[PDB]
Structure 1
Amino acid sequence: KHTPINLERDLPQGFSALEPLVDLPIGINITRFQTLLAL
């Protein structure tokens, strides 16, 4: 969900639902995940 946020340093006091995007039949297990950045 992409929410246009006014100038604030914290999560706003509001409600917003999260719509589904895609489902994938992978049949694998997940235990850890990481982050990726560009420089």
Structure 2
Amino acid sequence: GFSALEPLVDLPIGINITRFQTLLALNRADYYV
């Protein structure tokens, strides 16, 4: 199915970005890039 992505934030950071990494949590089929 088709689902448009609505904007949430527009951060005027203005910095150079080249890498990207996803953090994880702790617990006592995801991560699609």
4+ runs of 1 displaced by more than 6 Å?
none
Normalised TM-score (structure 1):
0.59
After superposition, the CA RMSD in angstroms is 0.7
Letter in 2 for 1:17: A
Matched, 1:36 2:23: yes
Q: Give the length in aligned residue pairs.
A: 26
Q: Which segments of 5 or more consecutive residues in structure 2 lack a partner in the other structure?
A: 27-33
CA distance in 2, matches of 1:38, 1:26: 26
TM, length-normalised to structure 2: 0.66
Work out the percentage of aligned pairs sharing the same amino acid.
100
Higher relative contact order (CA closer than 8 Å, sequence separation 6+): 1
